[PDB]
Structures are given as structure tokens and as C-alpha cells.
Design a protein around this ligand. Structure first.
Ligand code: CL
Ligand code: CL
Ligand code: CL
Ligand code: MN
Ligand code: MN
Ligand code: MN
Ligand code: MN
Ligand code: MN
Ligand code: MN
Ligand code: MN
Ligand code: MN
Ligand code: MN
Ligand code: MN
Ligand code: MN
Ligand code: MN
Lengths: 185, 185, 185, 185, 185, 185
């Protein structure tokens, strides 16, 4: 029986719907109003083998910040819901992924205690129209509602898109590991 | 009897109308042609319990600068008008507000002598489409027409939107304090 | 009608019961198995005018860590419960308190987003039998379950007991401010 | 047929009995006379899925050193015995585990050649009553009798209990990996 | 049906034949005219569970460079051929292996885009008769024809043979992981 | 008989068609969806006397990265195809071109071994709407599919458009030299 979490959340600023299947096939269905974030959520699905359905609208004329934040918060809650009683899972994930010259290590523990350790140094301010400060905020907000211990470490990288995408690949693979069944539990 | 100041000001560059109620309920009604500034003026209303009505148009195809400046000048004048004879008010305000990792101290004196002390270090050039140099200019122009002594001190912060928004929260709360009745005066 | 939050939480390591009245009279009733923590919780009650009832037992033969953490987590949850819908409160608190040569600034926002900014430099490892690393962990854990934005800044201090106690005084006064009714809301 | 190693060792200073099942269920049964070490050995069992039975007595009135050392030596020998001919196992283990802000990488090879690489910087001298110098000595002594190549690397951390516990989690998971069957061997 | 790639390549300088089975049993059959390289290719087979058959002759009286390069190029092509359509594989590999005091991290992606990140600092010029500059060139040439993203990071090490051998162990294990079936794909 | 290479390549992200005549007249016919890249490809044609026909579409709403990369990859392949057996050509090219204050040296070898040496320091993040990180990626991707040894050295320059355009002029002239007939071969 697949582990599925669903969240709908509305504020004056944003409207967000998330559905995540931890036992998915990598089905990617994300439309946030932030194209670069959509691309990253596609990576989350494809590299994590999650099914990810996201819809968001919001006040992107002000900036992408509120949308990005509210999407992340809802994803964190959806993950928490999907995990249920967390019985029999690996709990810990650890993966280091490259994307060309970029190399990003992610380690996480589905601990119930939120913590983000993050040291990315993204050398440009905009990837497409996406404000690169928002990457940290995405992970911070996700951690806060999921109750995840998450460390993200930049080991190499120069191209901003590579750095951010490698982060999502590594995160997805680490989260896949953590959420999967431990065969001895 | 509520303290209300109104200003209409037209130049070749901009057209601005401001109405501020110092004894308001936080009614936010701001449309400047600069969405991020609108968002900040909403914070001013909600955190200061001012009623803030602003309309502006201007030469935003050149850049947001003239609009931002002329809005600020008019707000400063409206504040001055609303304050009237300044009898029986606290006069001084002092508040430090966070927004997540950002922490901003504002101290002000409704002194009749303009002065801005400002040390924000906003680490990105654009929040949405808003040029972050314009934050200092907003406060400088406001001080100049209001005749306010204003100090803004960045105690912490990394996210530009957080830094700027925390500034407006702290300013609003400090200005609320300064404009309110001193119960012993 | 007084705002009261109650939490009972048991783990393999600890057993904790907390009851907090936000609208209290400073009634202090704290027994955690960690005498220095009891003393600090007494300060929280007396300086914040909270009624604080805490009972904890745990694995203090290993060290005080699990007890300290679980007490803090439960207090954060109790605060959250007590706050209820958070209508009409100040929400923000800001206070700087001395204790002799020590001087500690606390700023907080009852925001729903956990964040701790903390820069205390406590110059000794043990105050009585209390491990001074546990002060940061107390506030971090409290923030995490309460969903509080909390900044703690050491402005001066040399004596470890003074530094820590001044922190609790400042925190208590800032939290009192934040939880109290805003008379214009 | 489960791989079980047993050691009894007596000196003038200490008396130690160890039984370890490499193919266990995480049964934790450790009483060394050093409560913090007991807690760490519980982590070894739970995170490694070893069954760990330890009893020790010794000259803890002098300090915990001889007990800690003799426990570690006996565990290393028990591991060696349990491994038997080492046929068909992964041999290598590599895992990085967090505990909140702490992040510890362990890499090991069941090589038959003892080596410890260790760079932990534990910022306090006592965790509970446990001398934090003894952590290095525990791993060194274990390596020496097991004939293990072991590298322990502190990637992040501030709280001493977190640093040490994360080390044991990472070690346990790496040792589980190394001792498990390689499905292609 | 085992994935086997075969390459024969002749130049004026060298003559090389390679056959690699990705689904092997660790059969090592390598004779390049460079004994140290043979030893490393044996590690590749044994730690990766590849079957590796290599024969090379060349102008080693000039130096080992052309042989080393042409062997590496052919291995990269053989890997590419063996991988075929790359369907259903893990694609990514990440492993850190010790050899006594040496500790080497390898991360790779079978991406189709060649990239080598390499930071080994091998402290001697010759291991046996093998020029230690040739290690980097081996991996660079392999990457270039395989279309692999490869990062090699020296975490510790002093003995040149240990450093280089640990690199091949880590690489072999990471490449095994990447080339193996993903059980959910 | 003119040396013409043609490539059509489609991915989920981009659709690219390239036709290059090494023995051209400088016919420029490039439409990539990235106006600045079009301008640079026009320089390639005019300064190299290549006929360059490029059409690309792609996911430029995410950013220009995938388009830029896929165009470059296809150009590299087209060059490789056009070169055919590479008989009788100069093979090496070396040219240094100014554009006002900018001065860029390009040296290349049509070697069959991909390598990019690149040290441009482009002082602004956007030239028009073009992300200046993409210049390095363009040349890297081109090198990777063409099998070119390419060195790009910034000798002087301040204006980003000048720096990048001078690079394309120098590259075009060096590539013209390398691809032309050696009159003694
Ligand atoms: Cl590392
Ligand atoms: Cl201060
Ligand atoms: Cl030169
Ligand atoms: Mn935010
Ligand atoms: Mn991408
Ligand atoms: Mn101006
Ligand atoms: Mn905002
Ligand atoms: Mn803890
Ligand atoms: Mn005291
Ligand atoms: Mn000793
Ligand atoms: Mn513990
Ligand atoms: Mn060479
Ligand atoms: Mn060897
Ligand atoms: Mn790319
Ligand atoms: Mn031009």
C-alpha cells in the first residue's frame, strides 16, 4: 500500500497543493509558477522515484519568495504525512552526486528534529529568473515542516544551475534511501 | 479625532497621493507601481496600525527610482501633517524585529531634525524587480520631509527580502510607539 | 479565561509533564532533576509572570542532555497549545536585561517558523553540575516545537551563571511582551 | 547460522565479557560501569543491528580509562572471532550520519591491518561523567584487536554528546555494511 | 545476458585489446607492459566484480605514457560499448575506500558528458617504475572516451602506492554501483 | 568538394539543427532562441569564413542553459563530421584578437582529445539577457563532442560584450587556420 501524503494550504499570498508518493515511479507533475523550481522538483521525482504532484499560485509579481517558501512548507508536511509511523524504514540517507564540475553531498536523518546545515556558495544571483537565495530557503522550510535533519555540502562547482541541480539530485537519492524499507527491519 | 495627513504631489516624473491615519487599524491600500514597495507599505500599515493609502504613477520604464523617492517624500510630508502640534506623544520609538534569520533595530525621534543612520548590507541587487539600493533612498527621503531622526541597524540577516521586510516591521513598530499618546503627558 | 497549555511526553529516556499559564502570576513549580534548569525555569515564571509547572525524570546518570532536551521540547509544545489561535496578541517581544556585568538581548516573534539565532559564549563548562552547552540546546528545542523566531545576543558578561540567568530574564520579559494582549488589536 | 564472537578477559584492573552477533536484531545489553559508554554501545546495537552483550567491572575510582580500554579491546577481539574466515562479505563500509548539527563520516575496511584515522574535536572535557578523550582510545583499542582500517572524520558539530553519538551511529552503519553479505560473492 | 564491451585499437605507438564484462565475477586478466598498471587493473576487477581482459604493447622505452593513455582510452570505449542503452541502471556511484592511512572518495555519473575532477597529491614521482603523473592521465583518458563524470578526492594518505590503490578500489566500487541494476527501474 | 557537417538532435528539453561548411563564405544563419548567442555565432561565421546554419528551440523559460549546451554539443559534432578524415589540414590554430580594450588569445589543436583551458573573467552576470556563465559551458560542450584541444586566455578586457565577442573572433580565426589546407600536406 503506497505511502501518499497530501497537503492543501492557502494564505493571502499563495495557494498550494502537494501530493507525494514515497513508493512512486518518478512521475513528475509540478507547476509552481516558478519554472526553475519546477525543473528542480522534476529532478526530485526522477532521481528519488517519488511521484510528485505540485500546484501553486502566488504573488510572483512581488517576487518568487512567498511561493517558493509555501511550496517548500507544504512539501515538508506532505512528506511527514506520507511517512506515517515511520516503521521499518532506513531513516538515514547519504549520497554525493555530481553534475559535471559540481559535486554536492547530502546527508539526512528523518529524525523528527528540524535542522539545516547548508554551505552552498552559488556564484550568480539569478538562474533564469530564479533568485538563487531561494534555494536555501526551500530546504530550510522543507526541513522545518518535515522535521528532518539535513546537511548539504558543496564539494565542488562553478555553474549555478549545475550546483543547484546536483543538490536536488543528491537530496532526492538520499531521501529515497531514507524512506525505503530497511530489509532487516 | 484621528490624526490624518494627506499629500498630493505631481512632478514631470511622477504623480503621488498619500493619506495616512496615525490612529488607524492597519488598513493597507497602497499601489505605487512598484510591487515590492507595495508589500513593504502593507507591512508599515499592519505592524504600525496606521491606515495607509498610497497611489503613485511614474517613469518606471527608466527605473523605479523617481517613483520610490517621490512616494517616500510624500509619506514623510503626510506624517508631518498628521502629527500636527505633536502634543502629548511618546516622540521616541525603539524596536528590534526579526524575520527568521534577519534582525533589525530601529530607533527614531520625531525631533524636527532630519537624520538617517543606516547600515543595512543587502546581499543581492534585486528583490523581485526592486533595486535594493532604493531601500536606503526610501528612508532618507522620508526622513528629509518628515523631519525625523532615524537609525536603522542590521544585527543579523542573509535573505534580502527578510532583511528589508524586518526593517519595515521594526520601523512600523517604532513609529507606532513614537506617534502614540504618552499616558503621563 | 486564562491561556493554559499542558503536555505529557514519555520516551525510553525521559518522562516529562508541563503546564504553562500565559496569563499567570509568576507561580514557579519546576522539578526537572536538573537543579540549575529548575532555577532558570523559576526565572522564566517570575520575570515572565507565567505560571510554570514542570516535572521531569530521566537518564541523568548518562548526562543531563536528554532530560534538558525533552523538557524544552515539551515547554515549546505547551506554549504553542496555550497560544491557541494567537488572536489579538503583541506577537513580537524585545528586551535587554542585565545581571550585574552580564547583558543579554532577546528578540522574538511568535511567527510559526522555528529559528534560533544564538551567540552566547559561556566561559566555563559547568555551572554547578549543569553542562553549559545545554543552554543553547534548551532554546533550540523550545523554538523547534513552539515555532518561534528567537534571537539571543550576548552584549556583555563574564560570569557563566550571570550570563545564563540574564538570558532567561530577558527571554521571559520578551515572551511576556509577545504573549500579552495588544490593546489596539 | 549466526556469526557470534565471545570474549572473556580479566586483568588486575578490569573484568570484561563481550558477546556480539553480527547477524543480530539490534538487541542491546551493555553494562560497563560507564553510563555514557553504555549509551554508545546501545547505539552500536540499534544502528548496526548487532546483538551486543557487554559486562564490565573495573577501577573506575581511578578513572574510566582502564575499563573503557579493556571493553574496547574485547569488542575488537569479539568482532574478529565473529567474522571467522570473512568469506563473502562486503568488507568495506562507508557512511555519514548526522545528529542535529553534528555530521560524522566513517569509512572502514575489515582488512586485517589496524589503523585509526581520527580528527574529532570534542569541545568539552566531560559528557556527563565521561572523559571525552576516551572516545579516541575506544576506537583505537577496538581497531588494534579487530585488525580494522577505520577513518572517522568530523564534518560538523558543536554539542559533544551529538558529536560522539553521531560517530557511533555512522560507525555502526558502516560496520553493518562491511559485515553483511555481498550478494554477488 | 552479460554486458560485454570489446575494443581493439592500434596506433604507431601502441597496440591495445580490451574486453570488459560489467556483470562479471572479478576475473582479472591484464597485461599492459606496465606492471603497476596491471596491479591497479586487477583491483578494478576484484573490487568492481568486472571481468577485465587487457593486452597492450607499446613504446615503453620512450616512457609508459603512450601505453597508459591508449589503455585508458580503450577501457573507456569498452565501458561505453558494454553499457549499451544504459536502461535500468543506477547510473550514479559514490564510494569512499581506505587503504591503511589513505582515504579516497570517488563519485561518478554515467552521464555521457566527460569530466574529471581530480585532486590527488601523490608525494613520490615513481611507484616501482610507474610515473605517478600517469594516474591522472589514466582517469582523464578513460573519462573522455566513456563519457563519464568522475570526481576523485584525496581525503588522507601518505604512501603513494596506498593513495593510488585506494583510488582504484573506490573507483571500482563506485563504478560497480553505477553499472548495476536499479531494482526499482 | 566543400566539407559540410550536419546534425539534428532532439531531447525533452531542446531541439537543435546545425549545418556547418568548413569551406564557406561566412554565411550566417543562426537562430537559437538566445539572441546574444546568435550574435556570437554570426561572428563565428564572418571571422572564420564558415557557413553556419543553426536552428534551436528549447526550455528558455527555465533558463538559457539547456539550449546553449545542446547547441554547442551539436556544433561540436557537426565540426567533427565535417572534418572527415582530417587529411592535409593545418590541424593547429593560434590567434589573438582584440575588440577595443579586450584582447583574447585562442590556441587549438584538432587532436581528437577534448580539453578546455579557460580563464575568462567576465565582470558582469548578464549581457543583455544572456547569462555570462554560459560562455564557458558553450566552449566546454563544443570541445567535448568535437574532440578539440582548446585554450582561451583573457589578456585584457573590461566590457563583458567585448570580452565575449573578442573570444569568438579569436576562436573563429584560429579554427579557420586549423581547418584550412596545409599547402605542403
Ligand atoms: Cl568530505
Ligand atoms: Cl546592539
Ligand atoms: Cl602571453
Ligand atoms: Mn521567508
Ligand atoms: Mn538542468
Ligand atoms: Mn534620488
Ligand atoms: Mn514578505
Ligand atoms: Mn540532543
Ligand atoms: Mn541565580
Ligand atoms: Mn590506555
Ligand atoms: Mn543520546
Ligand atoms: Mn598524453
Ligand atoms: Mn598493492
Ligand atoms: Mn550543463
Ligand atoms: Mn557586438
Amino acid at each position: 500500500s503506497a505511502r501518499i501524503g497530501e497537503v492543501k494550504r492557502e494564505t493571502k499570498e499563495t495557494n498550494v497543493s502537494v501530493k507525494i508518493n514515497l513508493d512512486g515511479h518518478g512521475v513528475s507533475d509540478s507547476s509552481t509558477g516558478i519554472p526553475f523550481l519546477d525543473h528542480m522538483l522534476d529532478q526530485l521525482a526522477s532521481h528519488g522515484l517519488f511521484d510528485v504532484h505540485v500546484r501553486a499560485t502566488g504573488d510572483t509579481h512581488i517576487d518568487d519568495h512567498h511561493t517558493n517558501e509555501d511550496v517548500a512548507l507544504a512539501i515538508g508536511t506532505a512528506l511527514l504525512k506520507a511517512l506515517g509511523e515511520r516503521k521499518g524504514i532506513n531513516r538515514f540517507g547519504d549520497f554525493t552526486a555530481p553534475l559535471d564540475e559540481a559535486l554536492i553531498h547530502v546527508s539526512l536523518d528523518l529524525s523528527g528534529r528540524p535542522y539545516l546545515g547548508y554551505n552552498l556558495e552559488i556564484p550568480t544571483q539569478r538562474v533564469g529568473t530564479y533568485d538563487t537565495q531561494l534555494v536555501e530557503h526551500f530546504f530550510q522550510s522543507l526541513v522545518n515542516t518535515s522535521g528532518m535533519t539535513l546537511h548539504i555540502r558543496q564539494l565542488a562547482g562553478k555553474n549555478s544551475h549545475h550546483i543547484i541541480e546536483a543538490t536536488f539530485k543528491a537530496f532526492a537519492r538520499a531521501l529515497r534511501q531514507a524512506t525505503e524499507s530497511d530489509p532487516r527491519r
